[PDB]
Amino acid sequence: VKNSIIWFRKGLRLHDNPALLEACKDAKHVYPVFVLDPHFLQQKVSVNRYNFLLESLEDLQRSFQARGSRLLVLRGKPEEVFPRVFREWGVTQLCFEHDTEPYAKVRDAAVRRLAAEAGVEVVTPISHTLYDTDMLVARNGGAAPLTMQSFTKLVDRVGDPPAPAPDPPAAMPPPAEDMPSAAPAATGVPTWQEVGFKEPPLTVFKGGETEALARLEAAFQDPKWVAGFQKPDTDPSAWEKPATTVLSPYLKFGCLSARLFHARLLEVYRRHPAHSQPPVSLRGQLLWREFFYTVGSTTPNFHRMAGNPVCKQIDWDDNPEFLAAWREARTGFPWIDAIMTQLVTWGWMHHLARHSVACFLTRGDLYVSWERGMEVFEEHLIDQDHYLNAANWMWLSASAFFSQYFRVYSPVVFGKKYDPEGRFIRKFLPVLKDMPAKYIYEPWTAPLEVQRKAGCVVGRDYPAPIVDHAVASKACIARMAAAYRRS
Which residues contact ligand FAD (rule: CB under 6 A)?
231, 244-248, 251-252, 285-286, 288-289, 292, 350-351, 354-355, 358, 377, 381, 383-385, 388-389, 392-393, 396
- Nearest distance, CB of residue 346 and ligand FAD, angstroms: 12
* Distance, CA of 224 to chain centre: 26
Minimum CB distance to Cl ion smaller for 151 or for 414: 414
Q: Is residue 271 annotated as involved in ligand binding?
A: no
**Number of alpha carbons in the 13 Å side-chain half-sphere of residue 76:** 14
Q: Is residue 337 annotated as involved in ligand binding?
A: no
Neighbours of 83 (CB within 10 A): 16
Q: Is residue 231 annotated as involved in ligand binding?
A: yes
Separation between Cα atoms, residue 481 and residue 459, nearest integer Å:
34
Query: To which H or E segment does residue 156 belong?
Result: helix 148-158
393 binds, among ligand FAD, Cl ion, none (CB under 5 to 8 A by kind): ligand FAD
- Nearest distance, CB of residue 180 and ligand FAD, angstroms: 39
> What angle do the packed helices 320-327 and 334-345 form, to 10 degrees?
70
The 3-state secondary structure of 344-371 reads HHCCCCCHHHHHHHHHHHHHHCCCECHH
414 binds, among Cl ion, ligand FAD, none (CB under 5 to 8 A by kind): Cl ion
Minimum CB distance to Cl ion smaller for 401 or for 414: 414
Q: Is residue 237 annotated as involved in ligand binding?
A: no
- Short-list 350, 342, 352, CA closest to 426: 342
Q: Which of residues 102-121 bind Cl ion (CB under 5 A)?
A: none
Minimum CB distance to ligand FAD smaller for 9 or for 29: 9
Minimum CB distance to ligand FAD smaller for 74 or for 255: 255
Q: Is residue 378 annotated as involved in ligand binding?
A: no
Minimum CB distance to ligand FAD smaller for 22 or for 97: 97
Q: Which of residues 410-429 bind Cl ion (CB under 5 A)?
A: 410, 413-414
Minimum CB distance to ligand FAD smaller for 57 or for 246: 246
- Short-list 279, 281, 283, CA closest to 395: 279
Respond yes or no on whether the N-terminal peptide bond of residue 279 is cis (omega within 30° of 0): yes
Separation between Cα atoms, residue 87 and residue 5, nearest integer Å:
12
Separation between Cα atoms, residue 116 and residue 95, nearest integer Å:
13
Distances (CA, A) of 140 to 298, 391, 473: 13, 20, 39
Q: Is residue 4 annotated as involved in ligand binding?
A: no
- Which residues are CB-contacts of 299 (< 8 A; sequence separation ≥ 6)? 144, 308, 309, 310
Number of residues that bind Cl ion (CB under 5 A): 4
71 binds, among Cl ion, ligand FAD, none (CB under 5 to 8 A by kind): none
410 binds, among Cl ion, ligand FAD, none (CB under 5 to 8 A by kind): Cl ion
Q: Does 473 bind Cl ion (CB under 5 A)?
A: no
Separation between Cα atoms, residue 168 and residue 104, nearest integer Å:
26
Could you give the string, one character per residue 251-280, with x where binding to Cl ion holds by CB under 5 A and - elsewhere? ------------------------------
286 binds, among ligand FAD, Cl ion, none (CB under 5 to 8 A by kind): ligand FAD
Q: Is residue 139 annotated as involved in ligand binding?
A: no
In the complex, which residues of this chain contact Cl ion (CB under 5 A)?
A: 409-410, 413-414
Which residue positions form the known binding site for FAD? 231, 244-248, 285-292, 348, 351, 354, 383-385, 389, 392
